[PDB]
Design a protein around this ligand. Structure first.
Ligand SMILES: Nc1ncnc2c1ncn2[C@@H]1O[C@H](COP(=O)(O)OP(=O)(O)O)[C@@H](O)[C@H]1O
Ligand SMILES: Nc1ncnc2c1ncn2[C@@H]1O[C@H](COP(=O)(O)OP(=O)(O)O)[C@@H](O)[C@H]1O
Ligand SMILES: [Cl-]
Ligand SMILES: [Mg+2]
Ligand SMILES: [Mg+2]
Ligand SMILES: [Mg+2]
Ligand SMILES: [Mg+2]
Lengths: 120, 244, 246, 121
């Protein structure tokens, strides 16, 4: 069973997204901010990363930068799930390696469809 | 006294502030959760599973109850400082009231390796004219204290509820092998915001209102509450309530 | 600075008003929650059997009530942050013109309860762009506008609260002008203190906790600005709010 | 156009029920308590009453009693919606002339079914 890394500073979102993922059959690992995400990246290699933008300590863009730089992190599919209104951000995210950028609130059907899309 | 009366009221004010500060931040969490879960269901109508729909709504409800709990903590404080706390007497079987209260704290006691026990010294249809919610709250506060202030590494930790009939009313005893209360703070525990100077090495969280609201309820029933505890053996909390 | 007796009576007076605030907000917070709970429970038990339109409306109510509770929670949070002197601010480029116009509409109901005409004037054509926290500056305006209605003349022919918005090179100057009861000279600085209320023959009927301006001052100064009052007892009051450019 | 009277002291309950009734195509008249309910009964005759029990000023059992007495009123169908879930409270309401007693939380599908059943009779 695949392993997903869920990165968001909002606890309800993590709980909400994890439930959807676990109901399918995936295992979930959580990170409260950008750096904790990098700290748990040293522990293991996930099959997918669900990344928020606005976080304390380290925001989403920085995570994307440092993802594409390392030997092993570069080839992990990243789905951005952000509450950002501006679509200038969407361009900046997709360029930095984001395989898709989805807006909040998240739709469990549209989301699960994309996860299966990137794991098959 | 005036020179010290200012020092005393100034000490209370610091604790009142810290209480409002903490409870304000606590109320934010459930609210955020309710909002997120509602806006997610709303934004995704007719498109999600009945199973998902069910779970997301349970979260809205859990958080609503948590928010209600915290709002009651604030209102209980408000009615205490204003001395506006009231009671509504009705005939309730105390045997199943304490039994229902035991079953409510069972899960919490398991988490701290504590046994919850209820013993009746008299036949079980013990009835009195009392406030069922408020006396349940009295029972829960005392039971919670027994789990919270138990021994760190002891083999058989317990909290026991003993129901009997004394003089002409009802007597409830909440017993625990726990840390025990030092003899200097024996009278101080029922006061507002007061915690034991040790604080169990600051591990245990608490506002210190528990026993203050408990006393108030017990006395509004025309009863009294007292404690008997040995410094390091355990504690026995005594509650006596009349019947009409 | 002061005697021990006066330090005591002050603190006791502050306690009464803290007590009265907490008591009120406790009750105000209960109403939205009741609604939230009722609606949540109603949905959950009729889960498989609700009409989609009915489910949609039931969720809207939950969201609206959630927002009302959130507003009420912020009142309590501010009260808490005020006595801890730690308030936050979030600046963004907003139009000040409709920002005050929002607050004017938000009070016209309450302003009519006392026969007070709400006026808005501007020296420079809209929009007046400013880099300010829109929620907080709206709150500042409301607080002042509320005071203009609350402390207007009990029986006067022409009551008004005006909002004068004049732009300058250094920043923007907001004037909230009332022809109310006015403020005695001794209490001219005191009004911006926490829990301070003027105790007079005319300001005794009126209810308050004395936070409005205390919060207002803090928001304004966090914007790196200045706030002061100019009034004459019996004539009326003028509150000045200066918000500079960066 | 059928007109329903909605009597309950709880404002969220009224909003909740009113919406379900209006969405079915009925006119809804509200009462905050038992006395206001009877006051409005002088103005017009409703086709149906939805009635709470626990209310300030005047309670549902009183309302039911007074409804069953007056000549014009006693023919009006009454659904009781209440938090009182005891068998005794139900029976009492029933002898006092209630057509049905329903326990809270509000359950719209069952509510619509009963509202239809009574009005088309
Ligand atoms: N069963 C007990 N055993 C030991 N100490 C206790 C017990 N119950 C209460 N205390 C002490 O008395 C204080 C007052 O109780 P309470 O008002 O419930 O405070 P808290 O809410 O912090 O537990 C507690 O902080 C605790 O140190
Ligand atoms: N427009 C005004 N005219 C006269 N007095 C005012 C005015 N605005 C504020 N004040 C004075 O400032 C004091 C504190 O105001 P505020 O901080 O808003 O709290 P509150 O309005 O609840 O008393 C009031 O007691 C009042 O006397
Ligand atoms: Cl109550
Ligand atoms: Mg975020
Ligand atoms: Mg306690
Ligand atoms: Mg004010
Ligand atoms: Mg009612």
């Amino acid at each position: 069973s695949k392993k997903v890394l869920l990165v968001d500073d909002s606890a309800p979102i993590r709980k909400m997204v994890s439930f959807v993922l676990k109901k399918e059959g995936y295992e979930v690992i959580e990170a409260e901010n950008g750096q904790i995400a990098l700290e748990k990246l040293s522990e293991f290699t996930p099959d997918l990363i669900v990344l928020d933008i606005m976080m304390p300590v380290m925001d989403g863009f920085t995570v994307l930068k440092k993802l594409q730089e390392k030997e092993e992190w570069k080839r992990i599919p990243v789905i951005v799930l952000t509450a950002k209104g501006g679509e200038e951000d969407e361009s900046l995210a997709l360029s930095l390696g984001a395989r898709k950028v989805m807006r909040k609130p998240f739709s469990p059907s549209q989301f699960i469809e994309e996860v299966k899309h990137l794991l098959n | 006294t005036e020179s010290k009366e200012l020092e005393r009221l100034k000490r209370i004010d610091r604790m009142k502030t810290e209480f409002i500060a903490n409870i304000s931040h606590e109320l934010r969490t459930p609210l955020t959760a309710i909002k997120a879960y509602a806006e997610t269901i709303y934004n995704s109508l007719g498109e999600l599973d009945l199973s998902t729909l069910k779970e997301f709504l349970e979260v809205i409800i859990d958080q609503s109850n948590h928010l209600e709990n915290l709002l009651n903590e604030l209102l209980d404080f408000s009615r205490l400082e204003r001395k506006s706390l009231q009671i509504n007497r009705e005939k309730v079987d105390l045997c199943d009231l304490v039994e229902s209260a035991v079953n409510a704290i069972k899960e919490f006691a398991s988490s701290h390796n504590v046994n919850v026990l209820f013993e009746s010294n008299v036949p079980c249809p013990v009835e009195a004219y009392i406030d069922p919610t408020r006396i349940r709250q009295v029972l829960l506060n005392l039971l919670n204290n027994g789990v919270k202030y138990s021994k760190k590494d002891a083999p058989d930790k317990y909290v026991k509820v003993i129901l009997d009939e004394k003089d002409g009313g009802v007597l409830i005893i909440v017993e625990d092998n726990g840390i025990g209360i030092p003899d200097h703070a024996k009278d101080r525990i029922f006061e507002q915001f007061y915690r034991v100077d040790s604080s169990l090495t600051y591990e245990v969280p608490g506002t210190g209102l528990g026993l203050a609201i408990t006393k108030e309820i017990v006395e509004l029933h025309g009863g009294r509450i007292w404690v008997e505890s040995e410094v390091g053996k355990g504690s026995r909390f005594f509650v006596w309530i009349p019947k009409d």
